[PDB]
Design an enzyme around this catalytic site. Structure first.
Site, mmCIF file in Angstrom:
data_model
loop_
_atom_site.group_PDB
_atom_site.id
_atom_site.type_symbol
_atom_site.label_atom_id
_atom_site.label_comp_id
_atom_site.label_asym_id
_atom_site.label_seq_id
_atom_site.Cartn_x
_atom_site.Cartn_y
_atom_site.Cartn_z
ATOM 1 C CG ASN B 186 -1.823 -1.177 1.286
ATOM 2 O OD1 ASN B 186 -1.879 -1.801 2.344
ATOM 3 N ND2 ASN B 186 -2.422 -1.577 0.175
ATOM 4 C CG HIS B 188 1.026 3.065 4.185
ATOM 5 N ND1 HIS B 188 0.568 4.211 4.785
ATOM 6 C CD2 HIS B 188 0.064 2.692 3.312
ATOM 7 C CE1 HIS B 188 -0.606 4.546 4.272
ATOM 8 N NE2 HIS B 188 -0.947 3.612 3.383
ATOM 9 C CB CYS B 223 8.702 7.737 8.110
ATOM 10 S SG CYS B 223 9.893 8.284 6.861
#
Ligand code: WNS
Ligand code: WNS
Lengths: 264, 265
Positions: B186, B188, B223
């Site tokens: 995804n 991330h 992050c």
């Protein structure tokens, strides 16, 4: 994993893991390159190496990759089983080839192939050496004597000369640094990290709308644990790119390469 | 791997690979954390999740990690088979726990243990919410009902409060950036990358002469793929203990805090 019947190649099956996949939920080319490296290590282990032989360990000699070439027709999905077969072959006194074929375990269909050129150099001085006849006799007994090529075709992509990208680059990703996870057991940067660094300067839009079909990478010099790399990319065209990794400061070349991408 | 007899836990065996090992020719704590994540995912798939249930997917809700806690007695060697058992448990409205036990396949001895706390978040707004009954009931049938703790001990290190490192840090690694290999499906940043970043500020000297025994990490903020991280470490102590902080390199926004404990080889 096992040596095949004739003892001249090696096979292993791998289940693609959750963290090994990208946005299309298929294996990254970095996952493919790690598995080619894992099955290469399992083949060396099965025949008594660890990839130094007897004469090699004495006079501080090692095999090092000069070039990696990978063609993927279909990236395996998360949960899928891929079967990889690998073998080595002498290229006279110039060096050594390792070849790979990747299959869908379910269909038996060929989903990719890879080839690589290795040269011998001294571990300490990093000076290349045309291989000795005493070293061949030791490793020729683990190699098919008749030619067996993942890329048989005369005039094929795996053997083409790669030119030096000229400034200014169309695209760049600067200040790339390896972390401990990028190092091997001897604290050198693992060859697969350079593949990631090359791809880092491809725009997100290409990666989102295309799939990587071919990557050719020349290895010219090692990046040390404390060096810093700039990744440069210019469109040469399907989309084709020219690539250059170089040290952030003096711009010393570490790798060049090319990639070919197909619209999804 | 497979669900156990009673269907309340999941087991998988992993052969340690050439590239998963460090200077000692044993698995790095990042390789361990990847396998914990892989067996967690295989347990979710086994019981029909995707790690969302039906209600969660309706309400755009997700499980996210608040804390990870890993203790390693022995890192498995290159070529060793390691067996990992994993299960989850409700902690009521607060959230859920996932626990792991790592074993030497050959001896059957416990080589490690891990525990993690998960909370429910709106994907879009990032706003935490307590677990509702409708949701509780869906996943309760996949969890042991009696307590099963990887870390049962009374005053055990998995539950200690972690303080904020005060400037100046004894050690630091600046300008850490994720590449595509650090991202999940995804896009991330993978939770395991934060572990690597925490360890990047430990001097090579400590890593050459010690082995990591315990790591505790709180996850405060994600992050982003275009963020840059600074890794900060101060010695807090034959055992070395450190305090850790990851923050965004510009405004110094906290993303993570943690502690590690190392013993001399
Ligand atoms: C560096 C490429 C050669 C290599 O990996 N060595 C090997 C292992 C097993 C069988 N035959 C050979 Cl040549
Ligand atoms: C992060 C929440 C824990 C989780 O991954 N859920 C799960 C998976 C399989 C069985 N039981 C449960 Cl609770």
């Amino acid at each position: 994993g096992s040596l095949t019947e004739d003892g001249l190649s090696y096979k292993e099956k791998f289940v693609v893991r959750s963290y090994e996949v990208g946005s299309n939920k298929t294996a990254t080319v970095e996952t493919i390159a790690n598995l080619l490296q894992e099955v290469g290590c399992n083949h060396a282990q099965s025949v008594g190496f660890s990839a130094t032989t007897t004469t090699m360990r004495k006079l501080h000699l090692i095999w090092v990759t000069a070039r990696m070439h990978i063609e993927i027709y279909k990236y395996p999905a998360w949960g899928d089983v891929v079967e990889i077969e690998t073998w080595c072959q002498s290229e006279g006194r110039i060096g050594t080839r390792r070849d790979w074929i990747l299959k869908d375990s379910v269909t038996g269909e060929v989903t990719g192939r890879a080839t690589s050129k290795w040269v011998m150099m001294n571990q300490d001085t990093r000076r290349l050496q045309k291989v000795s006849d005493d070293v061949r006799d030791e490793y020729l007994v683990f190699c098919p004597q008749e030619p067996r090529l993942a890329f048989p075709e005369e005039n094929n992509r795996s053997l083409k000369k790669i030119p030096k990208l000229e400034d200014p680059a169309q695209y760049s990703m600067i200040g790339l640094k390896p972390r401990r996870a990028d190092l091997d057991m001897n604290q050198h940067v693992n060859n697969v990290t350079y593949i990631g660094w090359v791809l880092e300067s491809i725009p997100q839009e290409i990666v989102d709308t295309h799939e990587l079909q071919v990557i050719t990478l020349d290895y010219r010099r090692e990046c040390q644990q404390d060096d810093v790399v700039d990744s440069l990319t210019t469109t040469t065209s399907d989309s084709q790119f020219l690539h250059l990794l170089r040290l952030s400061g003096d711009g010393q070349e570490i790798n060049r390469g090319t990639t070919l991408w197909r619209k999804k």
